[PDB]
Design a protein around this ligand. Structure first.
Ligand code: HEM
Length: 406
């Protein structure tokens, strides 16, 4: 709808009509729609009048570079449109170093690789138990009956929460991650129901776990220090909330993306079923091939970049799809190749905000896939059905009916 007028720093030949929430051809798939943007010869930085007017990085080299220099490209605003964000600070996602660092250090206590190794059995239980619920059926909607459920069940185990509380957490997760609907007033109220609901829910748990010896995410966050002192109660609520939301919409959609693909590549499934080690070693490959995030950075100071003069406060969208699927970075990028030697992507971003959850994500994906093939070694996508895609900050897909012999 709303277009802004081309600013004086945007040359006419960098103008593309791209709506990140409604990509041309999104119905035929999210990755294909982004790739359709990245035509041969496209400049490294283009600009669109939609969503407030913003630049877009169009290949792996540019995505990487904008991601990794907070002095030039700040997380002061990371969400498009620039008015959305945007008051709520969701600490530390909008901080630059050094402010960012000790908040990230608190996140890392719950998510580091050594720590994640020790939760593998709990994640495997979530996955085998979800799958058991439907393996005997010979069909399921992968998205609604596994993907949507899995992150929340993982979070309960990692944050040591009663499984009984799934419905109330699920409701607040819906509200917090995809607010609805009719007016700006309506969406704000909806989001606040999510955010403030989750806030009341975790409050006493925070207080009970101060001084505690559990190694669940909540004890670890609330007992963290920030510049020499125990973290403020509210900051800790913010980290806990971030732990919940960081691993939710990304993982929900990512899991359906790769399952859609495996559903339509039985030979590849055969290959993985036969080489468990190749399966385990190929998480990076799946992350490259199915990136889901398009956050942004704000130009931190006036500066020349990629042939244009950028102004402080301009935004650059970083569609991470355009790194993993970039053929200048990964030859024959459409192939999910478990033997690929050099797997270049920014699916977890880059620089200091590079996904704190990336070790948990790898283990969730591998464990899901192992636990799936144990029970359901052969499977396909239901005849006469198609997935339904949306683009946005996080790529969305649903309707993943899969079927298997029984
Ligand atoms: C498919 C899986 C995932 C993908 C593709 C993904 C992607 C990302 C990306 C791109 C960022 C950087 C955002 C930016 O600053 O531009 C990020 C940050 C973050 N992610 Fe993930 N993520 C995934 C899974 C998870 C999981 C399982 C968790 C567990 C909670 C998680 C927690 C976080 C947190 C806390 C941050 C903020 C890091 C910081 O700002 O310093 N992520 N994620």
């Amino acid at each position: 709808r709303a277009k802004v007028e081309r600013p004086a720093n945007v040359p006419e030949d960098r103008v593309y009509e791209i709506d990140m929430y409604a990509l041309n051809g999104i119905e035929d798939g999210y990755h294909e729609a982004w790739k359709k943007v990245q035509h041969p010869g496209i400049p490294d930085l283009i600009w669109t009048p939609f969503t407030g007017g913003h630049w877009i990085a169009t290949n792996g080299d540019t995505v990487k570079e904008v991601y990794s220099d907070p002095t030039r490209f700040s997380s002061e605003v990371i969400f498009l449109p620039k008015e959305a964000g945007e008051k709520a600070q969701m600490v530390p996602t909008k901080m630059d170093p050094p402010e960012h660092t000790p908040y990230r250090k608190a996140l890392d206590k719950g998510l580091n690789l050594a720590k994640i190794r020790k939760v593998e059995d709990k994640v495997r239980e979530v996955a085998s138990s979800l799958i058991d619920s439907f393996a005997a059926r010979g069909e399921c909607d992968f998205a609604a009956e596994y993907a949507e459920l899995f992150p929340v069940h993982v979070f309960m185990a990692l944050a040591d929460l009663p499984l009984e509380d799934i419905p109330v957490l699920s409701e607040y997760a819906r509200q917090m991650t995809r607010p609805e609907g009719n007016t700006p007033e309506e969406m704000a109220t909806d989001l606040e129901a999510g955010n403030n609901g989750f806030y009341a829910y975790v409050d006493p748990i925070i207080r009970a776990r101060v001084g505690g010896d559990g190694d669940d995410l909540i004890t670890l966050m609330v007992n963290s220090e920030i510049n020499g002192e125990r973290i403020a109660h509210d900051k800790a609520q913010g980290l806990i909330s971030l732990l919940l939301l960081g691993g939710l919409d990304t993982v929900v959609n990512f899991l359906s993306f790769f399952m859609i693909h495996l559903a339509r590549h039985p030979e590849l499934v055969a290959e993985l079923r036969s080489d468990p080690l190749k399966l385990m070693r190929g998480a990076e490959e799946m992350f490259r091939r199915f990136p889901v995030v398009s956050e942004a950075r704000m130009v931190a100071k006036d500066q020349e970049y990629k042939g244009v003069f950028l102004k402080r406060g301009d935004m650059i969208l970083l569609p991470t799809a355009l790194h993993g699927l970039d053929d200048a970075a990964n030859p024959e990028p459409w192939k999910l190749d478990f033997s690929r030697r050099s797997i270049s992507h920014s699916t977890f971003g880059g620089g200091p905000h590079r996904c704190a959850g990336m070790h948990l994500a790898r283990m969730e994906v591998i464990v899901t896939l192992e636990e799936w093939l144990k029970r359901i070694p052969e499977f396909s996508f239901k005849e006469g059905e198609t997935p339904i895609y949306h683009s946005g900050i996080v790529a969305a897909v649903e309707n993943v009916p899969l079927v298997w012999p029984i």
